[PDB]
Amino acid sequence: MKLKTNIRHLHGIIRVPGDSSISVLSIIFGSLAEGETKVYDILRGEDVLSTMQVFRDLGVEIEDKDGVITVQGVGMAGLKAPQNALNMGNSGASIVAISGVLAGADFEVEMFGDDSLSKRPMDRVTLPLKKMGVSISGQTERDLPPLRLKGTKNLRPIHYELPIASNSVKSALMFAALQAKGESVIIEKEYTSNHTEDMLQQFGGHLSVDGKKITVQGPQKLTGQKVVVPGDISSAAFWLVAGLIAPNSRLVLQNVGIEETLTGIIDVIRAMGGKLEITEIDPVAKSATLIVESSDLKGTEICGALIPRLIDELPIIALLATQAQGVTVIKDAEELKVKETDRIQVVADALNSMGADITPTADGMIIKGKSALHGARVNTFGDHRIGMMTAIAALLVADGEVELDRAEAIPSFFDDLESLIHGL
Numbered sequence: 001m002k003l004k005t006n007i008r009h010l011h012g013i014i015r016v017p018g019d020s021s022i023s024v025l026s027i028i029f030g031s032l033a034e035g036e037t038k039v040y041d042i043l044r045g046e047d048v049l050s051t052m053q054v055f056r057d058l059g060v061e062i063e064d065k066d067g068v069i070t071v072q073g074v075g076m077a078g079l080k081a082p083q084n085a086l087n088m089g090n091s092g093a094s095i096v097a098i099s100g101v102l103a104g105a106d107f108e109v110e111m112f113g114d115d116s117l118s119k120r121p122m123d124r125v126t127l128p129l130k131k132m133g134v135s136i137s138g139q140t141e142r143d144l145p146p147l148r149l150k151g152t153k154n155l156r157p158i159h160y161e162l163p164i165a166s167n168s169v170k171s172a173l174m175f176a177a178l179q180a181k182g183e184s185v186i187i188e189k190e191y192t193s194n195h196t197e198d199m200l201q202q203f204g205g206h207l208s209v210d211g212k213k214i215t216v217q218g219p220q221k222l223t224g225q226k227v228v229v230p231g232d233i234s235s236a237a238f239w240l241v242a243g244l245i246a247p248n249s250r251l252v253l254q255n256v257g258i259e260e261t262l263t264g265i266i267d268v269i270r271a272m273g274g275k276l277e278i279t280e281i282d283p284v285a286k287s288a289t290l291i292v293e294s295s296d297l298k299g300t301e302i303c304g305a306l307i308p309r310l311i312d313e314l315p316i317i318a319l320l321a322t323q324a325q326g327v328t329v330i331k332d333a334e335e336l337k338v339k340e341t342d343r344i345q346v347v348a349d350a351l352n353s354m355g356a357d358i359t360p361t362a363d364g365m366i367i368k369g370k371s372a373l374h375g376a377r378v379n380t381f382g383d384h385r386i387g388m389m390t391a392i393a394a395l396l397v398a399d400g401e402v403e404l405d406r407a408e409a410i411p412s413f414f415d416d417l418e419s420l421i422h423g424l
C-alpha cells in the first residue's frame, strides 16, 4: 500500500485509546471476581472483543453499552463448560492467559485461532501448567494451536522459573496460582510489566514480590471494581510527535496518562523546543489533555534511563529527532538485548532509506537532524509501530512516494489521520 504524502496542515482532536493489557486484565478479573465490574475507556481492540466473547462463552454476563463494559462476576470457580470452541483470533496473548484462567476449570475446552496464531508455540505455558496438574496439549510438541484443555478441582501450586522473559506466561501462572490450594512461587527471568500484579491487588487479591520472586497464596476470592483504563503510552507518544513535526499543526490529545514514560517524553520535547501545553489535569484519574503545535525543534540528549518504556517508543522518537536541527544522542543506560539492538537497526534502516541520518551505536543511536525526508519503500515486517512511524514520516515527504506493503496493522488509524488532514 502507498501512504498519504505532503500534507500542508493537521488539526483536530485525538483521544488516546486505552491500554490493551489493562483492558484485557479487567475482563479477566471482572469475570473471576464476585460482584459487578465496570470498565471505562476500554480499548476497542479485537483482542478485547475476543476475550469478552470467550468469557461470555464460559457463561459470564458481559454488557457493552454506551462505551461501558459491565461484567457480572461469576466467582473464582464460576466458569462454566463452553458449548463451542473458544475463538482467540490472532491474539497469542489471549490463549496463554485464558489457559491459566482455566487451570481449575473441571471441563474440556478447545481454544483455536487463525493461520498466524496457529504457528506460535504454546509449550512455554503448557509446560508449567502441566506441572500443576492441568491437561493441556496442542499440535506437535511445541503445542501449536488449536489447544485442547482440561483443568482440575485439585490444582497443585506452581514452583517455576521462566526460561524466557514473558509477561504472558507470568500472568497465566498467576491466574492459575490464584485457584490452586497452597503456595505458588513464580520467578521471572527479566523484569516485565506489573499490570497483573497491580490489578490483582486492585481486585483485592494478595501477593508478595521480592525482586523477581512472585509468591501467590491460593485459593483467593476477588471483588468487583470500577476500572478506569489508562490511555495507551505508545499511542500518546505517537500523536505527540506527529502534532509537533507536521506543518501547520495543532492536536488536542485527550486521555493522556500521567506516568513516567510520558512525563519523560514531555521533558525531552520541551528541552527540544516543542510547543506543548498541559491542560484539563484530572489528578484522581492521573490523566491530562495535551496540546501540541508545529515546532522548531533542536537536537538533545535522550537518556533511556530517564524514559522507561523508551525501547517501545524508539520508532516514533527517532522520527522526532530526525526533525530537530542538530544532533540527538539516544544512549540507553543498560545493555541492549538482541531484539532491542535489532529494533534500532530496523528503525535506522527505514528512516535512513527516507533521507534521515541515523547512526546505530552500541548503546542506542545518533541522529543528525532536520532531514528533508524523501520517498522510499519500507516494509513493516509485522511491527505496527514501525509502520505508523513511517505513516507520519510520509506526511513530511515533499515529493516521492512511500510504499509500505505489509501494512496489516489493525485500526481506525487512517480515518483519524484523514480526519486531521481536513480539520481547521
Ligand code: NA
Binding pocket: 039, 040, 041, 042, 067, 068, 069
Ligand atoms: Na469501557
Ligand code: NA
Binding pocket: 035, 036, 071, 072, 073
Ligand atoms: Na453481579
Ligand code: NA
Binding pocket: 076, 077, 078, 104, 105, 179
Ligand atoms: Na477456580
Ligand code: NA
Binding pocket: 112, 113, 114, 115, 118
Ligand atoms: Na486456524
Ligand code: NA
Binding pocket: 029, 030, 031, 032, 033, 034, 035, 036, 037, 071, 072, 073, 074, 223, 224, 225
Ligand atoms: Na466482578
Ligand code: NA
Binding pocket: 230, 231, 232, 233, 256, 257, 258, 259
Ligand atoms: Na498511560
Ligand code: NA
Binding pocket: 231, 232, 233, 236, 256, 257, 258, 259, 261, 262
Ligand atoms: Na501515558
Ligand code: NA
Binding pocket: 263, 264, 266, 267
Ligand atoms: Na513533564
Ligand code: NA
Binding pocket: 266, 267, 270
Ligand atoms: Na517539562
Ligand code: NA
Binding pocket: 341, 342, 345, 360
Ligand atoms: Na545492528
Ligand code: NA
Binding pocket: 007, 008, 009, 010, 420, 421, 422
Ligand atoms: Na492537511
